[PDB]
Amino acid sequence: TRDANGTWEMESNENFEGWMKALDIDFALRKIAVRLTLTLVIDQDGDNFKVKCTSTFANYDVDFTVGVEFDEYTKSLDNRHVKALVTWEGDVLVCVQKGEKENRGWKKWIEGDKLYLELTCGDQVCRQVFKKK
Numbered sequence: 001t002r003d004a005n006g007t008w009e010m011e012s013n014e015n016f017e018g019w020m021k022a023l024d025i026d027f028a029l030r031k032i033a034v035r036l037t038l039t040l041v042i043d044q045d046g047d048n049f050k051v052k053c054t055s056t057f058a059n060y061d062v063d064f065t066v067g068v069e070f071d072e073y074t075k076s077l078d079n080r081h082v083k084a085l086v087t088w089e090g091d092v093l094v095c096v097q098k099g100e101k102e103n104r105g106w107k108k109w110i111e112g113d114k115l116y117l118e119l120t121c122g123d124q125v126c127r128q129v130f131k132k133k
């Protein structure tokens, strides 16, 4: 479905390390990140999205409108400037972040009370699954 609203709790997280390594995240912050609980809160009204990812130590919040390019500065991730664009490819929510890294972005599939998330950077894909709280 297109409706991604909800509080989403992580069920699984595969190749998180490899993805963070492809983004050049400090080996320090990687070790912290693998231990922290991650809650994904999405607020969706029409084309307008507010996404908040929250750990005990890190917040990653981004707001966007589907179909409208936006400049992004990944301050609490790898601290790069990208040109981001989120679109629908059928029911798949796709994000393409143009910049230094190739193949960079993420795809979200909402299947009922499950959310599947693939994050990509270079030749690395991290695969996550959340359950609606």
Ligand SMILES: *C/C=C/c1ccc2c(c1)C(C)(C)c1cc(N(CC)CC)ccc1-2
Pocket (backbone or CB within 6 Å): 020, 033, 038, 040, 051, 053, 054, 055, 058, 059, 060, 076, 077, 106, 108, 117, 119
């Ligand atoms: C639809 C999901 C997109 C998206 C963008 C940015 C991040 C995420 C998902 C998370 C939840 C995978 C995430 C986690 C983090 N750290 C903790 C807050 C871990 C590296 C940063 C950015 C994003």
